[PDB]
Subunit: 488 residues, 3 copies
């Protein structure tokens, strides 16, 4: 049973049958098979067309991931937390990190779930770390010079350096054991507690019309006000936000009504469980037939419609019911499962590209996956800096990467340990490129640790332009290593 | 026959005879044979002295090329164009590009005329591109910070990126066909038309004394005013400007007399045709004897002196004749042929150095030829920036490289196609250094394309210093590649 | 007799006996044997603990070297010079260079004294040159922007470039002859004379209480005023300064009493000769027994105590004796011998680390030895810049490296020539790393030579941040070369 890569060394007439036959070209989950798409669906003459279509689909999936994380995942998480009365400053610091890091976390979970894709996770986490500490942080200082806060900066840079070196040693050892994963998660909890304690010590020292409106994602006044490019982006997002509005309930403590849309919410009381059962483990559980007579989805629909009718007749259009926060729980779950589905598709596409072109998991992780997972960071942080909040954006840069690495490695490896019933996760490093990537991350961190205090925490355009030049040269070295020009 | 370079591996006593015998050490054109100079005329103990003398001669030739292009080629071209009503703004943008790019164009023509030297042309064009976009543009921003105009910058950077990638693909294919060369020239014409249209849409939205003076290149008042270094440079140029004044007529629409020097111009009516044929094809046609009795140069002299006498007796000292623009045509032709002769000498010297030291055409093209061809850019653009016109200088930087690459490749390859009666010009790339050079040019362009809009087009010293550091590291990598430290 | 690097490839039980037996693992001088410490005294499980202890001891030795040079060597040299009325401006320029460069000079002398350690000297001198011209000079411009003086800068950069290229050619030739060493020292004398002449041409154009106090190194008022880190450093230095106060006499022309401490000085009239005889050449001559009856140290003590009693009874507590400058001579000698002992220990430690880990002399010289020898430069120059004297600090940066290279190579090689009775010092370069280091130094110098005049000598944070990025990338390339990633 040959490897999947062998496909390109066969004759064109046996490619499609090889892909159909070889179990090493089959994916664990997902809905589309991109390799059968390339080698059976598409004429070989039109292979570059298939690949460009794949790239466009990948970019659109990154758009989906960003929108879902920004507008449906974090608001519901914030509703749940505000039900427990936190603080505005910790909220601002940390919820921005959760929102920016949901795609990285779910991509790492999906990649770690399979030994053939596990190198993608390391490539993407370290690659996003390099990109966010050079290009995004430097861009913030180029757009708006400011004076950084010294003590939070030193705290964040120290915690990040520790996490990075821990992962270096786990890579050298070649494995992640259960104790290591629990240690990663514990270190993240310790970091959040330290932030809390330090901040405290410093502080002391008609229904039809509302249905139509609720499902409309366009603000016509704002749309007319915007420029052409903003208009084009809005339309690029319209179908996605329509589906998200249809399926994901949202609870807003900021609004006086808490986004209580009676009929849309009662409809979602049917729709959301169905989407959950149809997207869980790729809907495998959906077609499971109970007792050989009734499938799971039918009984889900029955219970959902009964509960929807009961809620609709036991609630009022003006006043939300006393149990309106359970809707936040449900919307959090549905949004998480949507993000998981999109991440699964992205990982499958990247694996297919690696098979077709014989590219390593590390190089695909550190370029395409990292850039796609950092689009959201770039948008949110550059917007924050342009609005006059560059300290918050700069802090979010270093606070989100800590969450990415610690929670991504710890949770992804823990879930793989538990489901496989094994005792460890194998980290087989693929050549010299992983050590090149590690070296780049370390030296970027060293540059900032020396440079920022030397400027007395007054940051401007020179620091950012130096970081930009560094990232350019890093991509230089990566491409030279991937094509064999630099070999030990 | 034996390879020209095998000369060193011989005994000293057979070197001179080997060079005299081997047809692979002979040049197509020129007046001096530098290899016979090294191996026949000088003793083997004084080889480094010969090489230093060669380097000094090469620098002096670059001085000649710069002066001829600046003060005799462009003024006559401008006279011809102003005879047709050119605008002031397009004139300023584009005539500076022609003046800065004449040496690059003629060097590329000469190098493409021979398969042994064709790698020099690619090395010099890409190398000058890297040098002008880093060192010259950065130096402009270091000398005088300014706000760049966004739309012209984006237009220029886009056109340059397209031209560079087109040449990358022609290099990968390994040839330039006739259709490709015509496409290069057509794309340049399209670029000039686009500049015109965009600018328009934006705008709407005694005789003995005069002979003595005309042949004197010194301004005594200015000379006494200048410092020591400027004085030394003027003297370094005096013999060259004397010969240029003697042989090249100049027409100036700025002056009210249009530089009408009656007796000097009537003398030049004899001298200039003689220089043209004697430097045409390195003078081969000059000694062609018509009918076996009268050589070409004698009949040229006869016709020239008859025409000079007729013009002298049919014209007045105070009022130029009504045909004074034909003198601009003649001066344009004579200046072009002088530039061609100097470029031929430079290319022959570089080939001899490559034979003696076993250096590749790419490394000689990207260091010595590129620097020599960019001395004029540095002088003109830094002077413009120091006088308070940094926007014009910065625009000239990116507008001159487009002319260099498109017209140099297109015209040089087209002339070689037509002259050889072949169908294609073979581009045999010499190792890994050409791809190193391509990578440097591309990333430099990427750095500017990201950096300039991110600064909101406000350019200062930090951007320029980063570009300078980049160029230093590029020369690092080039020297490491040439000596084999990085390799496949 | 196997090369002592093969110690590791043996079984653990024969390591200690191998080290005890092999003469290639024995040092020329010093007091401790670090290899027997690693392989005989400690258990094989605690090797990393031994190495961390060695590193801490090495850092403490660098602290000792810095304190001795700053507070005991230079003050006595200044007393001797001020006895001859030297210029204050020249004093400020040049005495800072002697103080900053004493550790480099003595480390080079010790390393050149043995063929097994001679590569350390070249690595440390060039490495300190790279570090001081990038990190220290850039840090000065980041901490306090200023306008540099053009003529001193151009003079210094020219002299340094000449010295560096001279050493490149000596490395290519593979030796230092006696004429070369004398030429190095003569060129340094020429440089100092040139500085003098240029500056001139520009200018024209109870006893118990006093012993208790004299031996106390703490200033309680200042100590209480300082912060926590300064306090910790003070204690880190207390035992060292106690021993230095005990053994090294100091003469201060600034004080009106010239630091005349009658009883401490009379005690030092005994102590200092004893320390000299106990630390010269590791104490060999100390135990030499004259005539087989009386050792040298006993007769030294007898003469010292007689002379101390005579001086004590022939001098007054209030008025220093007429011969108070001989104490400056004695204190200069004692301080020099203390510095020599500390440098010997540092070199022996570095050789042991190279044996244990199979590291080259070049990489150990350019990282650990260079950083340790430049701690003093960083402290004094950054302190000078923060106090409002960045021109003096920036000048000291380029003036101290000239002293380091010229006097270190010239004097170290001359002393080795004379003592060995040979005619030359062999410079066997160790691989490609030495040429990597040479390339880094040259281009750094080129970057400054172009950049500083282009800014019109107005230096700010952008220039310094570029230099910092360069040094980071240099350490990149060094580590890649040491591990074989780049190679021939
Ligand atoms: Ca992200
Ligand atoms: Ca040019
Ligand atoms: Ca030093």
């Amino acid at each position: 049973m040959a490897d999947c890569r062998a496909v390109c060394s066969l004759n064109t007439s046996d490619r499609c049958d090889f892909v159909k036959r070889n179990p090493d070209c089959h994916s664990e989950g997902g809905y589309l098979d991109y390799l059968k798409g390339i080698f059976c669906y598409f004429p070989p003459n039109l292979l570059p067309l298939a690949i460009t279509l794949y790239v466009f689909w990948l970019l659109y999936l990154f758009l989906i991931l960003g929108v879902t994380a920004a507008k449906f995942f974090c608001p519901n998480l914030s509703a749940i937390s505000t039900s427990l009365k936190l603080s505005h400053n910790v909220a601002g610091v940390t919820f921005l990190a959760f929102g920016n890091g949901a795609p990285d976390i779910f991509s790492a979970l999906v990649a770690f779930s399979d030994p053939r894709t596990a190198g993608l996770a390391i490539g993407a986490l370290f690659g996003a770390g390099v990109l966010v500490t050079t290009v995004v942080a430097g861009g913030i200082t180029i757009l708006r010079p400011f004076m950084a806060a010294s003590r939070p900066f030193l705290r964040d840079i120290t915690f990040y350096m520790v996490a990075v070196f821990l992962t270096f040693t786990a890579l050298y050892l070649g494995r992640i054991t259960l104790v290591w994963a629990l240690g990663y998660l514990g270190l993240y909890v310790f970091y959040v507690v330290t932030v809390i304690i330090c901040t405290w010590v410093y502080q002391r020292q008609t229904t039809g019309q509302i249905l139509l409106q609720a499902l409309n994602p366009l603000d016509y006044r704002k749309w007319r006000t915007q420029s052409i490019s903003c208009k084009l982006l809005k339309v690029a997002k319209l179908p996605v936000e329509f589906l998200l509005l249809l399926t994901v309930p949202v609870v807003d403590p900021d609004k006086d009504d808490r986004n209580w849309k009676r009929p849309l919410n009662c409809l979602q009381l049917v729709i959301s469980p169905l989407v959950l059962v149809l997207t869980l483990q790729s809907g495998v559980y959906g077609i499971y037939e109970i007792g050989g007579l009734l499938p799971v989805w039918a009984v889900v629909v029955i219970v959902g419609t009964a509960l929807a009718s009961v809620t609709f007749f036991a609630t009022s259009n003006s006043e939300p019911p006393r149990l309106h926060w359970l809707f936040a729980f449900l919307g959090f779950l549905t949004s998480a499962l949507w993000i998981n589905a999109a991440a699964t598709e992205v990982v499958n596409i990247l694996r297919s590209l690696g098979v077709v072109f014989r590219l390593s998991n590390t190089v695909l992780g550190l370029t395409l996956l990292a850039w796609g997972n950092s689009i959201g960071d770039a948008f949110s942080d550059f917007t924050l800096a342009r609005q006059g909040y560059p300290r918050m954006a700069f802090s979010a840069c270093f606070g989100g990467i800590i969450f990415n690495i610690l929670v991504g490695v710890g949770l992804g490896c823990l879930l793989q340990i538990v489901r496989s019933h094994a005792s460890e996760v194998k980290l087989e490093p693929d050549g010299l490129l992983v050590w090149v990537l590690a070296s780049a991350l370390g030296l970027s961190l060293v540059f900032s640790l020396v440079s920022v205090p030397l400027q007395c925490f007054q940051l401007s355009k020179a620091y950012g332009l130096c970081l930009l030049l560094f990232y350019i040269c890093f991509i230089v070295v990566v491409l030279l290593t991937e094509f064999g020009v630099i070999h030990l």
